[PDB]
Amino acid sequence: SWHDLYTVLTAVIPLYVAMILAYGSVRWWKIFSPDQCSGINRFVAIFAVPLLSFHFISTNNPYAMNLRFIAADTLQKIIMLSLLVLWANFTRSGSLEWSITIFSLSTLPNTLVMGIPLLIAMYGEYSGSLMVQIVVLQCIIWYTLLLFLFEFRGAKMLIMEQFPETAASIVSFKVESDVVSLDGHDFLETDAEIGDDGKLHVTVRKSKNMPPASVMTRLILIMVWRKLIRNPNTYSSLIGLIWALVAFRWHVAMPKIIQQSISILSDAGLGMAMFSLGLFMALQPKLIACGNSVATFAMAVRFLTGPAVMAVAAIAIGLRGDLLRVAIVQAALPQGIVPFVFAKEYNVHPAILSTGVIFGMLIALPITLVYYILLGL
Amino acid sequence: SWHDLYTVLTAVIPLYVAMILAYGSVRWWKIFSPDQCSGINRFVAIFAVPLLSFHFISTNNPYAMNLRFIAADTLQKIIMLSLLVLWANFTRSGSLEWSITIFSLSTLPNTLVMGIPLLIAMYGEYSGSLMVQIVVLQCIIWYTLLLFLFEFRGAKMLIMEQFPETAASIVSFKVESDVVSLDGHDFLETDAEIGDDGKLHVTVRKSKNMPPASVMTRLILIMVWRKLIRNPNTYSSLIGLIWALVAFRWHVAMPKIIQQSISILSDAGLGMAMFSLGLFMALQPKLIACGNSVATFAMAVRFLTGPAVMAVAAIAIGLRGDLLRVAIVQAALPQGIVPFVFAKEYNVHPAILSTGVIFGMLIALPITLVYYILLGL
Numbered sequence A, B: 001s002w003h004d005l006y007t008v009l010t011a012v013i014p015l016y017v018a019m020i021l022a023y024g025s026v027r028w029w030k031i032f033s034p035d036q037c038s039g040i041n042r043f044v045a046i047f048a049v050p051l052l053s054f055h056f057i058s059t060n061n062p063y064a065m066n067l068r069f070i071a072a073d074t075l076q077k078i079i080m081l082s083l084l085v086l087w088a089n090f091t092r093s094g095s096l097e098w099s100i101t102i103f104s105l106s107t108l109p110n111t112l113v114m115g116i117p118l119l120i121a122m123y124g125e126y127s128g129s130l131m132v133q134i135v136v137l138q139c140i141i142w143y144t145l146l147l148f149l150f151e152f153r154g155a156k157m158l159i160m161e162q163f164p165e166t167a168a169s170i171v172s173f174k175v176e177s178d179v180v181s182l183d184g185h186d187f188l189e190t191d192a193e194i195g196d197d198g199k200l201h202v203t204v205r206k207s208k209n210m211p212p213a214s215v216m217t218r219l220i221l222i223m224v225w226r227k228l229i230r231n232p233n234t235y236s237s238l239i240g241l242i243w244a245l246v247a248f249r250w251h252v253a254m255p256k257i258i259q260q261s262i263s264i265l266s267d268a269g270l271g272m273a274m275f276s277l278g279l280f281m282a283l284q285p286k287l288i289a290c291g292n293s294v295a296t297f298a299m300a301v302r303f304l305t306g307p308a309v310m311a312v313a314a315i316a317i318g319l320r321g322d323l324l325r326v327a328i329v330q331a332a333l334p335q336g337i338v339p340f341v342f343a344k345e346y347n348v349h350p351a352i353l354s355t356g357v358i359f360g361m362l363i364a365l366p367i368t369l370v371y372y373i374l375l376g377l
């Protein structure tokens, strides 16, 4: 039908209009400097997106979630992680960094900003509720798992670099409150002291055998905790979830004054997010960075494997009707911004993630419309 | 009543919440740098406020304006300008810069951003329509008159500095397209050539007798035109007015796609404007700049003379009922941002205007509520 296509275009075009206004402001008319661009982008990340997340999560009933949809979204990632573990351990070509990159490319799309409007336009509001559930699960669990993997990689690198042979003896790790992460952008001294028992205790402070799993688990937990409490999305998600539980349990309503105080800043969310994406597009040198073959492989993964694995998982679970179409089209979305931020922070194939986010945002309208049409027959 | 006070507080508090969030981000938690602050502020000025103006103006019917309200708002400024001309010409203590500053302090409040919500909360939506009419008149006429006065001052200064004695002979001025203003921040050479007729022609190019009024008028018109076409508010106001005329004449409706493309960026307007005001508050060194006595005089002017002159003009015109209260409370609003921008640009008592905007924004809630209560009896 043509009315459906017009409705999808009406929903989706203004986001691209904002994106291209930002792109032209930086590129054609030169209205903003790189520092002003960074200021706008930091405002977006700190305030606008987290408040949008609080607005969406705090309004969705957590007692009425769909269990089969959650199970399918979980089984996709379980399948991918099982395949990646098999490949990484039983194939000499395997590696942890490529496993993380493939998992992010194939499992974690942009769901909050453009997913909800696009899916509401395509299928209705209940699709918006399903996308909100997906957002909650990504924010609480899978982003946390990404933090765990990145911190484990950093800790392994530090331990190998510092204690090539003594890594088996160490039993205790002490991290001073100054340290906040193990990205490798800080000068991390590592003192070693011999205890009365004859073992070695380690203190990591800001300036091939591994230790037993217990001390590694303790260290990873400490560092994940330290990064988790400095994350605006953590507070937004947790406070929104707790408020939703209390409100839908006791039917409590927020006072109008607090609600308006939140809304006045939440209303800028979608527009400022699209503007920030346009700024990111304008700041980079080339629209394609990784290259022709690598970009082709990344796009193929994102737009075929994710949908295919989702199809297999959804058929195995027993999804049918329009839930299956929603799941597939959601899996065919462009790649999310949070994994791209993590790739920047830890420098793990950031160019592929950049190509994903930007180029897939550009080409998702035709690809997603093709999925819509083929599934709609 | 207490319900009315609660409603006004509900309408007004979230603006202050956004302002204080920006203030704390810059001052207490140090989230933004001065350059990032400038980027956010420039985004606000270029995009958010102009699109908010287009949204408000393009939706207000220009065939149903109130003529007595317009006449009262015009007569206030006519009275003030007559008094200032008398004082400036017939008193040795008079001056043009002080006349401009007093006119701005006593006539031109912040009407677009906080005036419309506050007045709608106090009196209803029709008050919002009246405030929209006031916004239109300020944007088209009085801001243009301020530009004329500032450019006349700049031209007089340039002519006196360059041609102390020959200013009477010159008959023709040529300004090269490179020049855009006469603020004094540019190195403006002034070539003089003798014509065959024996008169002197002048070319002002980027690097006590006045000339006849005709050449001065021509020069002022050229420069006012050059600054008028580089002003986002000019385009927003003119296009909104033309669209409103056409739409309310032929009942044409904008297509949903264009309307949403505008709205996605207009929705950030009020919140980003309050955030920018908070940033301006945080960036300055002292909340009071001009001093105790000068600040007292400026506040007294803003919050007593404007209301008093408006009362006299509204009684003379014949305003009664609630229109009179609306006019007085509108006159008691804090000082507008555009005259403050002009004072920055031309360096004409900018500190007094800064105190006006910021401190009056802080203290307008009690003062304006006092006006509300006293008029409400």
Ligand SMILES: O=C(O)c1ccccc1C(=O)Nc1cccc2ccccc12
Binding pocket: A044, A045, A049, A053, A109, A110, A111, A112, A113, A135, A138, A139, A233, A273, A274, A276, A277, A336, A337, A338, A339
């Ligand atoms: O990665 C995502 O897109 C995502 C998915 C589900 C829930 C939240 C997010 C999320 O934080 N987005 C963003 C974070 C920071 C900056 C962003 C700028 C633009 C768009 C999304 C952003």
Ligand SMILES: O=C(O)c1ccccc1C(=O)Nc1cccc2ccccc12
Binding pocket: B044, B045, B049, B053, B109, B110, B111, B112, B113, B135, B138, B139, B233, B273, B274, B276, B277, B336, B337, B338, B339
């Ligand atoms: O001066 C005013 O407040 C005004 C009055 C009527 C119509 C428009 C305006 C106006 O452009 N405001 C502003 C311009 C530029 C930046 C601003 C930032 C914050 C608030 C208002 C702003």
